[PDB]
Ligand binder design. Sequence first.
Ligand SMILES: *C(=O)[C@@H](NC(C)=O)[C@@H]1NC(C(=O)O)=C(C)CS1
Length: 407
Amino acid sequence: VQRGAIITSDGVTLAESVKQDDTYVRNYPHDGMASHTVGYISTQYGTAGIESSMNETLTGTGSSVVLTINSQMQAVAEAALQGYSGSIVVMDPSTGAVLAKASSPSYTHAELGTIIESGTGSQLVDRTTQALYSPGSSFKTVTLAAGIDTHKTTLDTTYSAPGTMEIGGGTIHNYANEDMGTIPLREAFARSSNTALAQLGVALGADNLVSYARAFGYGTALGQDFSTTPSLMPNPAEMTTWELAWASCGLPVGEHASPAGPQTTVMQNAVIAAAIANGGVVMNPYIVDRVLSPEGAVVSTTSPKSLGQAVSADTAAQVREAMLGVVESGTGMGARVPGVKIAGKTGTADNGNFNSFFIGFAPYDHPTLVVSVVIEGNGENVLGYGAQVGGRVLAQCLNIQALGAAS
Ligand SMILES: *C(=O)[C@@H](NC(C)=O)[C@@H]1NC(C(=O)O)=C(C)CS1
């Protein structure tokens, strides 16, 4: 039996079964592309990805699986990650379709054995979906959305944003102790003030922060047809005030029975950006576009499915505005690309090294794409790199999407 193929939405075959003049052997053209997603199926080396999760379909002549992944956007994501540990998701904000999904370091089917026998390093980890990180200031997107949706603040409400501040028996600091004095929220957000945003976190309370995070998908195993490990938040009744403050800045510091939080996946970060870009409506991401019978009939198709409306459309619009300012004039100016209006939120989070995040969307006025990035600084300094990569990848992916839409 000839096992079914795995194919991108734009028609590039990534897994196929080739008849020998003698039986069938599994072939991965573009071996190395989208490995964590395609996966594999070996007696010796085990089982992963779509080869595993769609096995009954690929097996039974098998039917073929067409992914949502766009081979061109995927290649772009992959090139952006040459030389780093980290990952990138690109997603259609109105459907939850995953147009690219890249983790680094990665691997080819040809190296698998050697990778596994050696058992050293982390190439098999999918940092889009199976690695949990402190989102840092990227999470303030949520804090802001919730503050606005609950009518606790506005973008023009003023906050004192000093270098340092005492909250709930402990201190909160802006990066490098910068005292920005009294500024409006839109600006504190854009400049990514921890002391400003902490106060809004406190104004919200734990129940609000946690419940809005859950509404964007925390606690849910995101993916209709792929595995994401859930993003974590604490039991709100267990959180201290101080912990609430830092949590709202994207820093998990709780000492309690329930998990510290937030801890996010990059996938979870995309879903937040998507929902904000999609008028507050949260979409459960997916990666299988359709299934082809052995004779090519399109036998099923995955439908987009909402996980709820996390904030009002009004709130979503205010959050988009605030994210525009991040990129036009704030921490995320390295995401700027000439000719396209890009909005987003940056993040940086901590033995000496740290990680750089970015979530964004474009075009500002009628978003059709979303990006989520983490670049792990593994001793190296990668401040502002999340934003660099994100912008660049978004713009490239937009060009590809726009050619595809008119073709
Ligand atoms: C949250 O990520 C904050 N970082 C630290 C070290 O506290 C803010 N991060 C950012 C950012 O947007 O990445 C900057 C540059 C200011 S501090």
